[PDB]
């Protein structure tokens, strides 16, 4: 390809003209800086650094006094230094002669050096007498004269450090030898051996050789690396082909007489190992981070590579240009004869190249995605035991906490009855169920979840943030918006006084009120209050109960659920917010249940919420719960009570007592809310004085009631998600959880290439360059274990990962907290229940040939039961080859499955899975051609012992246009939108159980229940997070898995 | 005392880590001569700017030497013994052959200028009558103005008798002193296969 | 270097197919062209131009000026306007907090946040993002993807093309801005191509943008490029992929694989954008779930594809514009 | 019913790693507090209380001077103590040895106790000579060594 | 210890106890010579304790 | 220390019996010389690492 450049110089074409050199120093008097001299200031720091042509200029002692440098910072006024820097720069005058000839350039560098010492030294005492010695017309000839007229052999100039206020001692000093011809250079460079530690580099500035001289060895490697860095860059553009301006061709320094580290450091740089990057490469500490990379590159050299790197180490005296790299000099040496180049050169051809180490000493913990089966062959490895992290670097908490919007907090889902009759035979049956249940309490396994995850410490950070953003800043909120409700509650102990509707306060003088005080309940009271006002009038906007109405809250220990609820209406006229309870303090009146006959207790809206009873026996329990409802139905107009144990007996006897009593029938509807503690199986009954006569009053099937009706008993209830700290290669049997720890950077690749047998996600981060420890975090996921322990071939991609060590696993400071329970989307949870239900059916039946999934992802593999059984996936889109080839016992026939009953592949022991149905394309719009597709789906079945599962989506109406909590799974009109996809349409339920009963034979629609919720949430340990908790039981219900298992 | 305990807090001595900056030891040791030709430097001479006490560190950048490494040369051109890879030395003065007011002496004036300011803060705590605090601030005037007469000879005569010395025979070591922060001499032990060195 | 308006930065030109057939005779001919081309890379003379002129250091002063005019003065911007997008990106490292829609901040006490950090790519990601939202709905005004939708960016080394894209919607409800790549750092999850069979990766709008492969041979190259499109057509609804070497064989075989596979045909249209590095001959394929059946799906003449199809070979490639002085 | 728990410790898994113990004390120099150390102030009151792992730490006499504690309140600028507390925390260095083995935890509690008195006491004069006595890999074994090498029966 | 501890605690006694003595030579304000010859005695007294 | 802490952990006395081998007793005791002529060898002179 042979890359093009341009021999554009730099240090030469920077020196000003002689007759004009007057201006660019002193007569800078008239204007006033601002832009050139740059100055940043991190915060004890700063960096004032004037530039061009005032850089490369060294400050003369004594006159390095002056207030400028005297002002070290201590504090800086951006007005002081702009005026103050001028005061100094003004007073700098350097001896010169005004010339007439247009072909003369003033010699800055050496000339201003004389003004530094004070013209004491002869090289500066020569410029005093005849200052016209600095007017050169040709580079090199500039210096030549200041040698012949001295008899001296070499002048040496001290270089000053970059900053102006960093008044320390210089690291190195540069030296300029008198050398005209080529046969001259060879003499100085050869005599340059046997002399401490010196460096030259490739080409030269003005055509005169100049070497470097380092003070103390240690202060060599830090300069030698600062250059090797800026040269891996010049060969990035010259590798892609671009007109590069900068000149030297090869920036990499050359170590003449040198120590031993610079050897191992010279070779590693010569053969360009790095690849791209561009992540604000850390300039400080780059030295060691580069020298670490040097070692690990050697711990890989496949003989041939080793041979070379061990030679350039042992040699270290010739620059190793790479063929096309060498040509660039040859194309410019003929472009101008008489120009000096480093004589000793060696030329490459095939390097050869191998790997490239992706380094970047930036910030951030790097996340990985370990893929099963690579190139390498893994057989019988060690056990690489990690352990003991430390409380400061890794913190593990068992939560999980979630974050949403304020509008996402308040929300609920409504539910509506179905049956109009309560038969006298199933009324004594429904009784026996609730009686037989009550004795043996709900599943103890389900219990170690209700007590843990709490909305108290879940919406904790949501409100804590809005507290602080009030103590400072903030603007508008407007009376009534769910924001005015939020801040008048969650945060602040005082009152939020309003000015002109919008101003919301706005000024506290400086006394700052204390934060509020919620108590695992207040947030449930408020969330319900909003829903009461909302259920009253669907039309949005209000939350300020119309003046001179009185809401009465009932609770065991109320306040500040009423202290907050009250001062939200403080603005609007006369409102009464009264509370009753069995542990209440003023204003709330203390009173035990079932109340004295004396009390009158009158209101408009009542929210009853008591449960303080050990009670004992089912009969005493029944009488308390029922009677509290009756002493609330009369007390208010639009009141909603709270029943525990919604068992279809208890709940349906409540409707009974109320109905036959008053005006024949009451309009009832139970509801779930957000801020309930995800799964508390407690629901709220809502009663209203009807309109006419209700059609379907009672609850027939009762799915929401049923969520409670599924907790059975305790078997081996414990789970307790633990930790691990040890890896065994292709060795099954690891109880669910996660393992953190720490390993050596030299074996970090070996660790990763093993965790793939247990999971997918894994984070890693080193703390600081030197510590050489890289703590890992890995989550055990069973959705992967089924695709790993299939056969025996361990394989893996060991090669790839190893190309990260040393730096390439990220750098991170501060503390980091990883939870024990993560967080997932409500949809991702629902599928884990389709499988937890289905994994039950498959591993029980006699003989199977295979489990064949039709449509969907390569995922859904889980519940391939057993691991061994043939697993077929018929879908049009999927990645093939290696996994099917790596005999993980798979195959994917990429014909878009045609389910048109024309010709279907079947015959014996065939287990089919249909969780798709939603059209071959994302459309799913074929809703009437679906009941036709399911009609021609089951039709043509004479394949003996075959079974297949199919999924749905139904209900709609009373679960959307009444819900008013569109969190994630919301619906539009009749279309159901979930997560991604496009709106999917429902298919009339009754019609499915109307037809097919004459065509097919077996059709059992099983819904995933609470056992599936606990079990699947126990293995993956993925806690919900409100919102989806309330919306869950409704959605999960109307996706029945129809299993046609006949002959 | 208020900020001395902030200095002697970080350490009394320090070492230099392989390729990089200094390493202060959290210990508070007293200094001894045995440490000199071995390891550790007296930390009250390092230059890393401390954010606590900027006064104890200011009176220290007031001990800086004023010289240059005049590498003999005409001693090695004559072919003499030199125990170093290359020869070197350190004369302690300059020239000021043309300077109006001698330089070397004007640097001394800055020592007195700020060292006398420190003396006042003791005559404010022990507050003695003007006459006492004056008769000391008057002594530093005489002391300093004497140095201005020595400045001439100590620059262009007692500096030629030094530049000669570094060229003599029998003198073969480098006692380089510029930059106290990082200088250690060389060990040249005569080793034997058996026995001790 | 050049200077324009903020509204002149974000912008693109669309292109539409023409032929409805892909004859079985010119399909092996079109193949031979792309095969014979691939070996001998594009004109080396054309090369010493792509590497030089960069939109990185072209829109450099445009954004640098709006950075300083924020550290002092400034007034209104309004959430959403291509200005709110500009300042919430190009300049500032912190967050641009809003007060009453119009006030845009407005008062920092005196700590001054550091300037941002674009990287010869971020400006191309954002410019495309605007064009995605725009192609979705021609009618102007939005740039705030409706709440609770999730855009997923795919790139070799992404961020802060996502750090910026995210905190532009920080105000409006719950949005997810996820990124994948072969050199990514947190939040972006690291993953190599062609991805493990485990990943689910779901979203609404996907912008795929990877090219890290020396590859070697034309056949291995073809298989990578085509398969990345398929693992994106299923993953999203309104997704646009990025193909290299738009040679009328490669590009027209992409339409082929997608068409016969799913619901008979997909609505396709390739586009060019501003902030591309003037002439990079790389174009973006845009796929959508049709409406009915498309009339003219394939590319007959292919002029935009042809811009790439004209680089022939190296003869006396060097130019290097010099100086003179006589 | 038999309730379930978890044997998750606290005071043990709080002590930092030896090679990294460098950072979590002195090199806290580079960042600047704000969140950790909590401070409320009812109004003659207040309660500045830095936490983890700077709690359970006892202040060495004399070096319990320094303007931080000297500032009793009298008045507090939420800017003074944030800058002032840094000035102190900066200057705390505790003797240690940098290790290579990944299965070693530095012993804070007892180690920083020695820095309090001034290394006068033998239990602190033992840690001066060989500071590597604080690098334990297993709890209990940490203290056991600081007994066998003293003949002492109990430290307080 | 480099400089003995026990004695350095005494220096704090003198440091602030002497400050209290000044507030009496401001009310009874005696000429510098008097107020000085007492603040000079505490120097000798304290340096003995060392 | 450290070595003393890990050496005394093994014990300060052993018995040479078992027909060979050594039987270090994991306990710290003193010598006193009165038990010289028995089955107790001072464990610091063992040679075992």
Of the candidates A501, A470, A499, which has an alpha carbon nearest to the alpha carbon of residue A486?
Answer: A470
Closest residue in chain D to residue F9, using alpha carbons only: D148
Angstrom distance (rounded) from CA B58 to CA B74:
40
Chains A and E touch (3+ CB pairs under 8 A): no
Of the candidates D118, D95, D116, which has an alpha carbon nearest to the alpha carbon of residue D107?
Answer: D95
Q: Angle at Cα A365 formed by Cα A360 and Cα A367, nearest 5°?
A: 100
Of the candidates C92, B40, C98, B21, which has an alpha carbon nearest to the alpha carbon of residue A222?
Answer: B21
Coil/strand/helix, residue B76: coil
Question: In the listed set A360, A379, A399, which residue is the last one of a domain according to the structure?
Answer: A360
Out of A169, A218, A287, the one facing B179 most closely (by C-beta) is A169
Of the candidates E45, E39, E13, which has an alpha carbon nearest to the alpha carbon of residue E24?
Answer: E39
**Using the beta-carbon criterion (under 8 Å), do D63 and B52 form an inter-chain contact?**
no
Instruction: Output Rg (C-alpha) for chain A, integer angstroms.
Output: 41
Question: In the listed set A360, A393, A427, which residue is the last one of a domain according to the structure?
Answer: A360
**Using the beta-carbon criterion (under 8 Å), do A367 and C190 form an inter-chain contact?**
yes
Tell whether the torsion through CA atoms of A372, A377, A379 and A384 is positive or negative.
negative
> What torsion do the CA atoms of D72, D76, D77, D80 make, to the nearest 10 degrees?
10
Which subunits count as partners of chain C given 3+ CB pairs below 8 Å? A
Q: How far is B28 from chain E (nearest CA, A)?
A: 7
A130's tokens? 């005849």
Q: Are residues A75 and A108 in the same domain?
A: yes
Q: How far is D43 from chain B (nearest CA, A)?
A: 31
Q: How far is B2 from chain D (nearest CA, A)?
A: 8
Q: How far is A62 from chain C (nearest CA, A)?
A: 36
Contacts of A979 in chain C (CB under 8 A): 202
Angstrom distance (rounded) from CA A772 to CA A767:
8
Closest residue in chain B to residue D127, using alpha carbons only: B27
Out of A44, A261, A291, the one facing B51 most closely (by C-beta) is A44
Angstrom distance (rounded) from CA A847 to CA A866:
12
Q: Angle at Cα C164 formed by Cα C160 and Cα C166, nearest 5°?
A: 115
Out of B51, B85, B94, the one facing A120 most closely (by C-beta) is B94
Closest residue in chain D to residue F1, using alpha carbons only: D149
Chains A and D touch (3+ CB pairs under 8 A): yes
B9 by Cβ neighbours in 10 Å (0-12 / 13-18 / 19+) ranks as: buried
Of the candidates A471, A478, A543, which has an alpha carbon nearest to the alpha carbon of residue A508?
Answer: A471
Question: Which neighbouring-strand residues pair with D19?
Answer: none
Angstrom distance (rounded) from CA A232 to CA A236:
7
A958's tokens? 């009373």
Q: Are residues A186 and A59 in the same domain?
A: yes
**Count of CB pairs separated by less than 8 Å, D with E:** 6
Q: Are residues A411 and A316 in the same domain?
A: no
A765's tokens? 């981060």
Q: How far is E13 from chain D (nearest CA, A)?
A: 13
Q: How far is A387 from chain D (nearest CA, A)?
A: 7
Of the candidates D148, D145, D63, D88, which has an alpha carbon nearest to the alpha carbon of residue D111?
Answer: D145
Angstrom distance (rounded) from CA A1018 to CA A377:
34
Instruction: Output Rg (C-alpha) for chain C, integer angstroms.
Output: 22
Q: Are residues A294 and A429 in the same domain?
A: no
CB of B50 closer than 8 Å to CB of B58: no
Q: Are residues A292 and A417 in the same domain?
A: no
C112 touches chain A (CB under 8 A): no
Contacts of A390 in chain D (CB under 8 A): 13, 15-17, 20, 105
Question: In the listed set A337, A360, A383, which residue is the last one of a domain according to the structure?
Answer: A360
**Using the beta-carbon criterion (under 8 Å), do D23 and A768 form an inter-chain contact?**
yes
How many structural domains compose chain A? 2
Angstrom distance (rounded) from CA D109 to CA D92:
15
C234 touches chain A (CB under 8 A): yes
Question: Which neighbouring-strand residues pair with A212?
Answer: A174, A199
Coil/strand/helix, residue C300: coil
Contacts of F4 in chain D (CB under 8 A): 148-149
Angstrom distance (rounded) from CA D3 to CA B85:
79
Out of F2, F9, F28, the one facing D133 most closely (by C-beta) is F2
Q: Is A593 annotated as a binding residue?
A: yes
CB of B10 closer than 8 Å to CB of B16: no
Of the candidates A780, A773, A770, A767, which has an alpha carbon nearest to the alpha carbon of residue A816?
Answer: A767
Angstrom distance (rounded) from CA A798 to CA A751:
9
Interface test mutation site (partner F, options D99, D134, D145, max chain F beta carbons within 10 A): D145
DSSP label at residue C13 = E
**Using the beta-carbon criterion (under 8 Å), do B94 and A287 form an inter-chain contact?**
no
CB of A77 closer than 8 Å to CB of A67: no
Q: Is C159 annotated as a binding residue?
A: yes
Q: Are residues A354 and A389 in the same domain?
A: no
Q: How many Cβ atoms are within 10 Å of A794's Cβ, its own excluded?
A: 20
Q: Are residues A274 and A349 in the same domain?
A: yes
Out of A720, A744, A767, the one facing D6 most closely (by C-beta) is A720
Angstrom distance (rounded) from CA A504 to CA A507:
9
Q: How many Cβ atoms are within 10 Å of C169's Cβ, its own excluded?
A: 21
Contacts of A367 in chain C (CB under 8 A): 184, 186-190
Closest residue in chain D to residue F5, using alpha carbons only: D145
CB of F11 closer than 8 Å to CB of F28: yes
Q: Are residues A335 and A385 in the same domain?
A: no
Q: Give the domain range for residue A732.
A: 361-1047
Q: Is C227 annotated as a binding residue?
A: no
D21's tokens? 């113990």
Q: Are residues A338 and A447 in the same domain?
A: no
Chains C and E touch (3+ CB pairs under 8 A): no
- Compute the half-sphere exposure of residue C245: CA atoms within 13 Å on the CB side of its CA: 21
Q: How far is A288 from chain B (nearest CA, A)?
A: 9
Q: Are residues A307 and A383 in the same domain?
A: no
**Count of CB pairs separated by less than 8 Å, B with D:** 22
Q: Is C281 annotated as a binding residue?
A: no
D34 touches chain A (CB under 8 A): no
Which subunits count as partners of chain D given 3+ CB pairs below 8 Å? A, B, E, F
Q: Are residues A448 and A387 in the same domain?
A: yes
Q: Is A74 annotated as a binding residue?
A: no
Question: Which neighbouring-strand residues pair with C285?
Answer: C241, C270
Beta-strand ranges (E) seen in A511-601 are 550-555, 576-581, 589-590
CB of A999 closer than 8 Å to CB of A847: no
Contacts of D152 in chain F (CB under 8 A): none
Chains E and B touch (3+ CB pairs under 8 A): yes
- Compute the half-sphere exposure of residue A170: CA atoms within 13 Å on the CB side of its CA: 14
A633 by Cβ neighbours in 10 Å (0-12 / 13-18 / 19+) ranks as: buried
SS (H, E, C) chain F: CCHHHHHCCCCCEECCCCCCCCCCECCCCCCCCCCCCCCCEEHHHCCCC
Coil/strand/helix, residue A927: coil
Counting every residue, how long is chain D? 156
Q: Cis (ω within 30 of 0) for the bond into D53?
A: yes
Documented resolution in Å: 3.9
CB of D149 closer than 8 Å to CB of F4: yes
Interface test mutation site (partner E, options D60, D62, D114, D121, max chain E beta carbons within 10 A): D62
Angle, nearest 10°, between helix axes C26-39 and C218-233?
110
Q: Are residues A491 and A637 in the same domain?
A: yes
Question: Which neighbouring-strand residues pair with A948?
Answer: A912, A1044
Query: In chain D, which residues are followed by a C-to-N distance beyond 2.5 Å, i.e. a gap?
Result: 43, 75
C34's tokens? 């792309």
Structure method: cryo-EM
């Amino acid at each position: 390809w042979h890359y093009t450049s341009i021999n554009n110089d730099t240090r030469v074409a920077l020196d000003p003209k002689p007759n004009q050199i007057r201006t660019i120093t002193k007569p800078n008097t008239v204007p006033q800086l601002g832009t050139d001299y740059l100055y940043t200031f991190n915060s004890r720091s700063h960096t004032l650094r004037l530039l061009g042509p005032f850089q490369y200029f060294n400050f003369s002692e004594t006159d390095r006094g002056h207030p400028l440098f005297r002002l070290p910072l201590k504090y800086i006024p951006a007005d002081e230094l702009i005026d103050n820097l001028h005061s100094w720069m003004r007073s700098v005058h350097l001896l010169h002669v005004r010339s007439e000839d247009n072909t003369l350039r003033y010699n800055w560098m050496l000339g201003v050096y004389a003004r530094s010492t004070n013209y004491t030294t002869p090289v500066g005492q020569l410029v005093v007498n005849a200052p016209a010695i600095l007017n050169y017309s040709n580079p090199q000839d500039a210096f030549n004269s200041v040698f012949v007229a001295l008899g001296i052999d070499y002048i040496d100039i001290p270089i000053t450090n970059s900053n102006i206020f960093d008044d320390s001692s210089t690291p190195y000093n540069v030296r300029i030898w008198h050398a005209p011809t080529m046969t001259e250079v060879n003499h100085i460079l050869a005599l340059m051996r046997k002399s401490t530690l010196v460096s030259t580099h490739s080409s030269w500035h003005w055509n005169v050789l100049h070497t470097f001289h380092y003070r103390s060895e240690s202060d060599m490697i830090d300069h030698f690396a600062a250059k090797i860095l800026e040269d891996w860059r010049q060969k990035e553009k010259l590798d892609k082909g671009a007109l590069v301006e900068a000149d030297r061709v090869i920036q990499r320094l050359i170590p003449l007489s040198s120590s031993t580290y610079v050897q191992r450091l010279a070779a590693i740089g010569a053969l360009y190992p790095n690849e791209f990057t561009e992540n604000v490469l850390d300039l400080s500490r780059l030295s060691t981070a580069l020298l670490q990379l040097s070692d690990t590159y050697y711990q890989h050299a496949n003989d041939q590579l080793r041979r070379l790197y061990r030679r350039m180490y042992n040699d270290s005296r010739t620059l190793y240009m790479t063929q096309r790299h060498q040509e660039l000099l040859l194309a410019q040496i003929t472009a101008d004869p008489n120009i000096l180049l480093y004589p000793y050169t060696y030329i490459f051809t095939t390097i050869p190249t191998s790997m490239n180490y992706i380094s970047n000493t930036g910030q951030g913990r790097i996340k990985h995605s370990l893929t099963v089966t690579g190139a390498t062959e893994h057989d019988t490895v060690a056990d690489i035991v990690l352990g003991q992290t430390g409380e400061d670097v890794i913190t593990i908490s068992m939560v999980e906490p979630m974050s949403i919007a304020v509008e996402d907090m308040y929300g609920y889902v409504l539910d509506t009855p179905t049956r109009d009759i309560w038969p006298a035979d199933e009324q004594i049956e429904q009784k026996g169920d609730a009686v037989a249940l009550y004795d043996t309490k709900t599943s103890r396994a389900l219990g170690m979840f209700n007590n843990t995850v709490r909305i108290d410490d879940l919406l904790s950070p949501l409100l804590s943030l809005v507290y602080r953003t009030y103590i400072k800043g903030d603007t508008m909120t407007m009376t009534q918006g769910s924001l005015d409700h939020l801040t008048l509650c969650a945060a602040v102990d005082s009152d939020i006084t309003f000015v002109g509707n919008r101003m919301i306060a706005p000024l506290p003088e400086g006394y700052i009120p204390k934060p509020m005080h919620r108590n695992n309940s207040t947030m449930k009271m408020l969330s319900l209050y909003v829903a009461l006002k909302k259920l009253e009038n669907f039309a949005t906007n209000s939350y300020l109960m119309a003046p001179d109405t009185s809401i009465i809250l009932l609770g065991a220990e109320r306040e500040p659920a009423v202290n907050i609820l009250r001062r939200f209406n403080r603005n609007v006229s006369n409102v009464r917010i009264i509370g009753m309870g069995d542990r209440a303090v003023e204003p709330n009146i203390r009173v035990r249940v079932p109340f004295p006959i004396d009390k009158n207790i009158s209101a408009d809206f009542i929210i009853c919420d008591i449960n303080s009873y050990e009670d004992q026996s089912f009969e005493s329990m029944f009488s308390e719960t029922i009677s509290v409802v009756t002493t609330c139905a009369s007390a208010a107009t639009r009141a909603l009570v709270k029943i525990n144990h919604p068992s279809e007996y208890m709940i349906n006897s409540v409707i009974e007592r109320l109905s036959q009593l008053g005006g024949v029938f009451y309009h009832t509807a139970l509801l779930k809310t957000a801020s309930q503690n995800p799964y508390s199986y407690e629901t709220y009954i809502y009663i209203t004085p009807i309109a006419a006569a209700v059609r379907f009053p009672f609850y027939s099937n009762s799915a929401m009631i049923n969520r409670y009706m599924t907790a059975v008993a305790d078997d081996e209830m414990p789970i307790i998600p633990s930790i691990h700290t040890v890896i065994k290669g292709h060795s099954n049997t690891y109880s669910p959880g996660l393992f953190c720890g720490c390993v050596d950077v030299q074996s970090a690749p070996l660790a990763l290439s093993q965790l793939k047998s247990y999971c997918s996600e894994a984070t890693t981060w080193r703390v600081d360059s030197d510590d050489n420890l890289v703590n890992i975090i890995a989550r055990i996921d069973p959705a992967r274990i089924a695709l790993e322990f299939r056969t025996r071939s361990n394989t893996s991609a060991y090669h790839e990962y190893q190309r990260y060590v040393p730096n390439g696993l990220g750098f991170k400071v501060r503390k980091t907290r990883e939870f024990r329970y993560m967080h997932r989307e409500v949809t991702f949870i629902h599928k884990l229940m389709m499988y937890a239900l289905i994994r039950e059916q498959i591993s029980l039946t006699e003989n199977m040939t295979q489990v064949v999934s039709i449509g969907g992802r390569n995922l859904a593999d889980i519940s391939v039961v057993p691991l061994n059984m043939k697993y077929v996936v018929i879908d049009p889109a999927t990645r093939i080859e290696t996994l099917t080839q790596e005999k993980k016992n798979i195959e994917v026939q990429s014909r878009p499955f045609q389910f048109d009953a024309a010709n279907m592949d079947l015959e014996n022991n065939s287990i089919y899975l249909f969780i798709a149905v939603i059209m071959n394309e994302p459309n799913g719009a074929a809703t009437p051609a679906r009941m036709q597709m399911d009609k021609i789906r089951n039709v043509a079945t004479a394949m003996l012992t075959r079974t297949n599962c199919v999924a749905y989506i139904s209900f709609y109406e009373a679960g959307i246009i009444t819900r008013l909590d569109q969190s994630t799974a919301h619906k539009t009109i009749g279309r159901l939108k979930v997560a991604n996809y496009v709106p999917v349409d429902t298919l009339v339920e009754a019609d499915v159980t109307l037809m097919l009963r004459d065509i097919g034979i077996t059709h059992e629609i099983i819904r995933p229940s609470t056992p599936e919720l606990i079990d699947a949430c126990s293995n993956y340990g993925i806690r919900l997070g409100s919102t989806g908790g309330a919306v869950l039981d409704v959605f999960n219900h109307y996706s029945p898995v129809i299993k046609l298992v006949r002959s | 005392p208020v900020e001395y305990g902030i200095f002697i807090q970080r350490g009394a001595t320090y070492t230099i880590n392989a390729a990089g900056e200094f390493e202060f030891s959290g210990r508070n040791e007293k200094w001894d001569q045995s440490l000199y030709l071995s390891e550790h430097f007296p930390a009250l001479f390092s230059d890393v700017p401390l954010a606590g006490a900027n006064t104890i560190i200011a009176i220290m950048r007031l001990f800086t030497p004023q010289g240059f490494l005049r590498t003999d040369d005409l001693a090695i051109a004559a072919n003499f013994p030199r125990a170093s890879r290359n020869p070197q030395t350190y004369i302690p003065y300059t020239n000021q052959r043309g300077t109006v007011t001698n330089e070397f002496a004007s640097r001394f004036r800055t020592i007195v200028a700020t060292l006398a300011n420190v003396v006042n803060e003791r005559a404010v705590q022990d507050d003695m009558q003007k006459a006492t605090r004056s008769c000391t601030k008057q002594w530093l005037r005489h002391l300093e103005t004497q140095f201005d007469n020595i400045a001439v000879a100590h620059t262009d005569h007692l500096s030629v008798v030094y530049a000669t010395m570094s060229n003599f025979m029998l003198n073969f070591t480098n006692n380089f002193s510029g930059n106290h922060a990082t200088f250690k001499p060389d060990q040249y032990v005569i080793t034997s296969p058996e026995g001790s060195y």
